[PDB]
Write a protein that binds this ligand. Sequence first.
Ligand SMILES: CCCCC/C=C\C/C=C\CCCCCCCC(=O)O
Ligand SMILES: *[C@@H]1O[C@H](CO)[C@@H](O)[C@H](O)[C@H]1NC(C)=O
Lengths: 48, 49
Amino acid sequence: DLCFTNVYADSFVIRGDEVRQIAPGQTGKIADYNYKLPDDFTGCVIAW
Amino acid sequence: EVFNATRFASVYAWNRKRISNCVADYSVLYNSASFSTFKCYGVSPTKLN
Ligand SMILES: CCCCC/C=C\C/C=C\CCCCCCCC(=O)O
Ligand SMILES: *[C@@H]1O[C@H](CO)[C@@H](O)[C@H](O)[C@H]1NC(C)=O
């Protein structure tokens, strides 16, 4: 029941044990050198 | 000697070890170790450095 403004989709592949790293904090190999989310994040994360 | 050891202990006789006089640079674990669970409680991970 909402309408969204500036929708961007980002895509990639990783290893299972690294999925917990896709979150605002979460230091680690993936979050320090490859992909980082901000602290003021509005959106959704999906993995399969 | 802690993470890449040879035999671990039983949960009923769990082992305990002291650590002192050392530099805690954990990025040396990135090349070899892959943890399934990691959770810190009274501290944020982005500040451990
Ligand atoms: C061998 C005992 C070392 C004593 C460490 C004491 C304080 C530092 C606390 C936590 C760092 C441990 C490594 C965190 C796991 C690596 C993942 C990462 O965050 O990149
Ligand atoms: C332990 O030895 C080295 C130390 O980093 C590590 O690369 C290797 O994968 C480990 N071997 C074992 C116990 O599987």
